Amino acid sequence: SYQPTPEDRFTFGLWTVGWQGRDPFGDATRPALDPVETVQRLAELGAHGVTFHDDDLIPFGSSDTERESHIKRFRQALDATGMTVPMATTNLFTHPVFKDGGFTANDRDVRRYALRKTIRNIDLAVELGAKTYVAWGGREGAESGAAKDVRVALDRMKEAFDLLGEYVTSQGYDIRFAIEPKPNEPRGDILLPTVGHALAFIERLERPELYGVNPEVGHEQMAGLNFPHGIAQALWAGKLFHIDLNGQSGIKYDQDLRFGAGDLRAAFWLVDLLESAGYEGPRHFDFKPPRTEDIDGVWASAAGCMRNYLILKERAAAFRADPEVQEALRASRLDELAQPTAADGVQELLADRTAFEDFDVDAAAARGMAFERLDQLAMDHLLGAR
Amino acid sequence: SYQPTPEDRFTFGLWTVGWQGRDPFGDATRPALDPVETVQRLAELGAHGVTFHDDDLIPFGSSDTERESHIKRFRQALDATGMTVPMATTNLFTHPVFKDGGFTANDRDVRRYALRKTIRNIDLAVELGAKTYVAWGGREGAESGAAKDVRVALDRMKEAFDLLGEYVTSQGYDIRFAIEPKPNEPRGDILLPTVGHALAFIERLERPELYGVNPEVGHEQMAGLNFPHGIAQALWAGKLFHIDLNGQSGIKYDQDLRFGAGDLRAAFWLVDLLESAGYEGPRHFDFKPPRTEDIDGVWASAAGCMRNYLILKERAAAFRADPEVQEALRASRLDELAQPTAADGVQELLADRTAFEDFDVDAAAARGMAFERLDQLAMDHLLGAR
Amino acid sequence: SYQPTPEDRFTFGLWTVGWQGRDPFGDATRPALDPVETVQRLAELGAHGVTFHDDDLIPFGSSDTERESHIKRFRQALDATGMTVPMATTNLFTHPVFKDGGFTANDRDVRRYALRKTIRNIDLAVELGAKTYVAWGGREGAESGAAKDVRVALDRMKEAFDLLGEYVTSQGYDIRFAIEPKPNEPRGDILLPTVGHALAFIERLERPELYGVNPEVGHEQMAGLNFPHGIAQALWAGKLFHIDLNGQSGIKYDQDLRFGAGDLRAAFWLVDLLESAGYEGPRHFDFKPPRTEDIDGVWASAAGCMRNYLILKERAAAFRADPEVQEALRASRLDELAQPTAADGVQELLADRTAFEDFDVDAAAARGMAFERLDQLAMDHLLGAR
Amino acid sequence: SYQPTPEDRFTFGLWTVGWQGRDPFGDATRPALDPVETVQRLAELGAHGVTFHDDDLIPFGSSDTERESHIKRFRQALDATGMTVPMATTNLFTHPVFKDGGFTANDRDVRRYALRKTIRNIDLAVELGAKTYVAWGGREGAESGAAKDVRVALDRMKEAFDLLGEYVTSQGYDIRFAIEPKPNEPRGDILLPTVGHALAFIERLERPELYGVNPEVGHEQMAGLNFPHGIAQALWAGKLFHIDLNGQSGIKYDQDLRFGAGDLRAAFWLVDLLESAGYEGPRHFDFKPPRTEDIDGVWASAAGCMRNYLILKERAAAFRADPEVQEALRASRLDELAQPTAADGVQELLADRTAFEDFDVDAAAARGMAFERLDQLAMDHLLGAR
Ligand SMILES: OC[C@@H](O)[C@H](O)[C@@H](O)CO
Ligand SMILES: OC[C@@H](O)[C@H](O)[C@@H](O)CO
Ligand SMILES: OC[C@@H](O)[C@H](O)[C@@H](O)CO
Ligand SMILES: OC[C@@H](O)[C@H](O)[C@@H](O)CO
Numbered sequence A, B, C, D: 001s002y003q004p005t006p007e008d009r010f011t012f013g014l015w016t017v018g019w020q021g022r023d024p025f026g027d028a029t030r031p032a033l034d035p036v037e038t039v040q041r042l043a044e045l046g047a048h049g050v051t052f053h054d055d056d057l058i059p060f061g062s063s064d065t066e067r068e069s070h071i072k073r074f075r076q077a078l079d080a081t082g083m084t085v086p087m088a089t090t091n092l093f094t095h096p097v098f099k100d101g102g103f104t105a106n107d108r109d110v111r112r113y114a115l116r117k118t119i120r121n122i123d124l125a126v127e128l129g130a131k132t133y134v135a136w137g138g139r140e141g142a143e144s145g146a147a148k149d150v151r152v153a154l155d156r157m158k159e160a161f162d163l164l165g166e167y168v169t170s171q172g173y174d175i176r177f178a179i180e181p182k183p184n185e186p187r188g189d190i191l192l193p194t195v196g197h198a199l200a201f202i203e204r205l206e207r208p209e210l211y212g213v214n215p216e217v218g219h220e221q222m223a224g225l226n227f228p229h230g231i232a233q234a235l236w237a238g239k240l241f242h243i244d245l246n247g248q249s250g251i252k253y254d255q256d257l258r259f260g261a262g263d264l265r266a267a268f269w270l271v272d273l274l275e276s277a278g279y280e281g282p283r284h285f286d287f288k289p290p291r292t293e294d295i296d297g298v299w300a301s302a303a304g305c306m307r308n309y310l311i312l313k314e315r316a317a318a319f320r321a322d323p324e325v326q327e328a329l330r331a332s333r334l335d336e337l338a339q340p341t342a343a344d345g346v347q348e349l350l351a352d353r354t355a356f357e358d359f360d361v362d363a364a365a366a367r368g369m370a371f372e373r374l375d376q377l378a379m380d381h382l383l384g385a386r
């Protein structure tokens, strides 16, 4: 039961299962993993594909020869297993040069370097098949107020994404960008801190059609936000180009628990939403097996990501299929929410005494929403207590 | 010192100083205030104007005669004092009819009523001089996941704001809308929870030019966000149509402390930003004198809002004017942040070996940002310890 | 399935199901409930008993005649249904007199009044059978720093609880006190903000044996804390005299969702802990049916509290009973956690080279904890996916 | 102005200014510092002393010869400068062996090793003059619910601290322990998450007099708590043995900003409290110069810690000394808070009709607390706007 297969589109970053366990207070607890080993183990577990930062696949500073060798062995593992690479990204955060940012570093020379580093890896991503190129500007931001003029930083951010769009347009590449918001960590505050801020920013780019969001469960939860609601807004905008799935236990450091852990009910509502919306993209896990775990625990945690998605998918489908739930949704007027408020237009509305002058507010107010019965059906379905 | 005058554009809602002190666990501690008294007392304190919800100025359910009488006495007080009304709004949250929303209530008849209630008060706002009409959808949202289909709710929200835009266009009115985000409270999660989400939503409206944001200090802080940064993004987008100033002591219920209270350093950076950007709009306080206070404390707290803005304005101007700060900003490369990254374009950048092949990442990395010295100059200026 | 009966010890406050729906931004959505109706409806749903504040049972300011009448009808309903009253409490928060506190109000006369109000209701609680008397000092605290000298306030708090202990000792009463922490709301910060602070405070009382804690799920979660962990510390201390069960969706205003809602996994671990510890006390729900609901939704939400406890109880028992889980617990060394570290004493430990000089830290470090496999068994059990 | 001298008791951990800048997403931005260099630079800046973890002073795994050499050079630097060592601690968090804890690791052999590692460094701390030995159990806790039985973990924690107390008693050493709470990070939840939990735990130790707390500004703020209030409770309990001073920008990862940064008003109220209470202990900064900074920024940030304490000390003293503030405190009944509520005892209170029967609750309720005027005097003093 709940056995993943490539059909399910589950993907993982090299840096997820490959996390060695270093944290702000801790040295590594596991050895580095060869990307080839990761491709093989994930294929065996039923994954569809793998994603990478440039510097996860090719060690930073590699010579051209060394680079080509790391790429070759990775391609052979992908080719052997049938694993895909639907997304890739750039590491614009680890190297000390990026301490004040990549695209919004105060030093101009750093901004230019960030763009070149990105462009090099776009070319590689395209060859390997990626259709989405993620950008997580984890160093874009500040710890103090005068360090970063945010209006000017947004000018630089826009400039950078507009040039990237000019580059992929001039190359004829198919690939789209997905901007990943995060509220904080490793900067005190990160620019584009939520899905909304990223969506808004995209609308000022030259070619907005080339850009969407890559929201992450835990990131929105680091602002105490409702991740399903934010995904709904991204879907409403036509901008859910990719997603990062994991768990997070509230407002704290980015934990990257396996998917299903953390806010379990939010995981359920997320799966419900992705499945009813027909999201087509990868089901990508950006998670970290806790550093308590050895390599066997790494693979158990990765398998758990997929298993939990599949359990939740089953529960959400059962919920929506249940005639008792379909009736409860009507009792709660979810059908009526879909009716246009005033298709009849402004003049009709203004002349309609049933909308104001003769509207019985007390009788409307007295009508319960029946949301608790509805939500207890959802609870019962999630828990298998039906 | 720090004496406000109408020149300073300070405004207050009737519901701010007029808050009787009811809270989730508490009955009123102060009597209702006559709006006439409020206009007179605020004028005496140096305010520029006053704002209102419909139902603050005219009791809900008033007959047409009663309505006209409340409006008349208010207009006479405004006229006597020279107090202005730069903004008004609708109460779509208190009456039980709005328990599931106004514009996104599941019941269609409620949605229509919300629109009529709004339109009636738009007409009054325009007569009284308001150039901004705020919409805070405090009941739009949910406590449970199936209660609200957020994509469909956003359809209804858009429909509602688009009709309002059609109405003010057809009337020839000058007035613009300002959508006020809030993450939660009184709903478990509110739709459009942050500045970013509101900015993004506006870009899908039919006439986006008619809509901006009304961010509130405490609201963004209820998501742990950096309010100055969010204001910078709103300014960058050209959408800071109005602002609500107050204080908030972290991630908790909406406190509505007087401005300057709560996160004092964020208040400083906010004033610094508004003043350097040349924000033109009202300096509106959406605050509540704590229910510990009697009426004398109400006016003291309102005076404190204005005093703190003026102190911070002085400190921020001194900071920016200090040659030592101008030098520290250069040391931190804030000047260089304003240089275009690659005005020279994509082909130049790609051919520039100083951007990649020959870029000395270690020498760049070793260059400190000098942000701590800069921030300690800012601290010294805020504290008057210069 | 999952049908509660009085054997299950579920209790509810009059003020829970009886909440009329007033919130900081909203008028009542439901009529007041007669306490007699509440006793009858809860009995029908399978509850064991009911709790009250003084002013929920007898309207504030009632004459002695009126008081006696409200008590009489309540006692007859209890007697008719076999409903019990295991706990009662005082309302030291609603009336404006308590705006700065009850026991720690700055005004001495208010402190004395708070004590008299409490003592009167202790006598009534004892007659009705309560064995625990809760004290939630919701007004004890501050919005500003100089308003409350916390050391002195703690002196007053101790004085007050010590006198209450002298009173119940002199009366020979059996009843114990349970102090309820909360971090904030309705004060900006509340004194004794968490389980730990309350536990610590109790240890400075004259008769600490008379006092324990009444932790509430949502309250600890308003500080982002792990409620099961805090309950474990209270149990470890022998101080879990009562508990308030509900749900909370993160760090925000006190939501009082039905139990099971909010952090579902924390609800599971809480039930697991209460059941393995053999907690004997009432399973008390301090929750609010959302104001979206009519009276039928009130009773559905109350029934859902009990149903969710019973589902979780079944899942937790299945988890602990599963041989595969018992093996995983051994694999994770939960058995070894129960072995004394050094029963052998200090000199042995210091002479034991296997503890230091000859301890192979790398071989120990390499041993994974197997916590992910364990936690996925727990997930599978919770979801019924076993 | 605001020049620190050793008289001011400012101290710093080796690991503070010596932080190389590694974060969860970042490699080091600065070279390791020689502890000798740190002692000399801090002495030049006006510090009083320095603190250390074992493994900051002596690299982990050093031979006995190497150990003795690192100690010798450190002692000579201390002796040359007159720098003191008032506190030391053990690193029970970095090495992978501690991935599930030190004293509460599930593996018994790890628990024993943790104790031996601690005892070795207690002996060194005592020789160097430390009067407080801090214990921050950063690895004690869990990411998942069944991984850690918290009641049993608390048994192990108590066992460990009781043995340490037996050891220092048997050695005749003068030194006391200070337990440092933290809510999370690097564990998902840490045991003893707040000041209150630590205070409560101490009261179950065999020799409670040997143990106090070492609260850290940012740690309590990671739970959204009021740090001054928690310090007041620790002082009330007689348990403020040491303190860690820094800044934190709300509920997020542990930032370790310089003192004064983050919540500036809380820093003011903290200094006000420490100075009025006559806290005698070190003014210890547990902070990290941001990794944006080079070594010159490191020393600027350290100097800023001390400068901000001294500015705030001046402002708080001016506030308390101001006759206008002394009058406002009376207007707010802070004097009356210090009067015993009922020194007259229970029978008097019960017979006193002015406390209940004849208490005019409405006249008391109507009396404003005047807290806003008081708090605006505090604001004016902090800002130097008096
Ligand atoms: O918080 C870290 C981020 O989630 C990244 O892993 C991005 O997804 C890719 O750089
Ligand atoms: O949280 C309440 C909101 O701040 C409102 O006061 C809006 O500004 C106006 O309806
Ligand atoms: O936040 C409100 C509290 O939870 C109360 O309901 C107490 O439990 C009883 O006064
Ligand atoms: O969060 C890290 C802690 O603050 C430590 O630095 C302790 O103070 C000493 O181990």
Ligand SMILES: [Mn+2]
Residues within 6 Å of the ligand: A216, A218, A219, A254, A255, A256, A286
């Ligand atoms: Mn993450």
Ligand SMILES: [Mn+2]
Residues within 6 Å of the ligand: A136, A180, A216, A244, A286
């Ligand atoms: Mn991610």
Ligand SMILES: [Mn+2]
Residues within 6 Å of the ligand: B216, B218, B219, B254, B255, B256, B286
């Ligand atoms: Mn507000």
Ligand SMILES: [Mn+2]
Residues within 6 Å of the ligand: B136, B180, B216, B244, B286
């Ligand atoms: Mn507002």
Ligand SMILES: [Mn+2]
Residues within 6 Å of the ligand: C216, C218, C219, C254, C255, C256, C286
């Ligand atoms: Mn509650």
Ligand SMILES: [Mn+2]
Residues within 6 Å of the ligand: C136, C180, C216, C244, C286
């Ligand atoms: Mn409660």
Ligand SMILES: [Mn+2]
Residues within 6 Å of the ligand: D216, D218, D219, D254, D255, D256, D286
């Ligand atoms: Mn810290």
Ligand SMILES: [Mn+2]
Residues within 6 Å of the ligand: D136, D180, D216, D244, D286
């Ligand atoms: Mn510390």
Ligand code: NA
Residues within 6 Å of the ligand: A034, A035, A056, A057, A058, A059, A070, A071, A074
């Ligand atoms: Na490789």
Ligand code: NA
Residues within 6 Å of the ligand: A161, A162, A163, A165, A166, A205, A206, A207, A208
């Ligand atoms: Na573009």
Ligand code: NA
Residues within 6 Å of the ligand: B034, B035, B056, B057, B058, B059, B070, B071, B074
């Ligand atoms: Na009026």
Ligand code: NA
Residues within 6 Å of the ligand: B161, B162, B163, B165, B166, B205, B206, B207, B208
């Ligand atoms: Na429009």
Ligand code: NA
Residues within 6 Å of the ligand: C034, C035, C056, C057, C058, C059, C070, C071, C074
């Ligand atoms: Na009654």
Ligand code: NA
Residues within 6 Å of the ligand: C161, C162, C163, C165, C166, C205, C206, C207, C208
């Ligand atoms: Na006592």
Ligand code: NA
Residues within 6 Å of the ligand: D034, D035, D056, D057, D058, D059, D070, D071, D074
């Ligand atoms: Na050394």
Ligand code: NA
Residues within 6 Å of the ligand: D161, D162, D163, D165, D166, D205, D206, D207, D208
């Ligand atoms: Na002991």
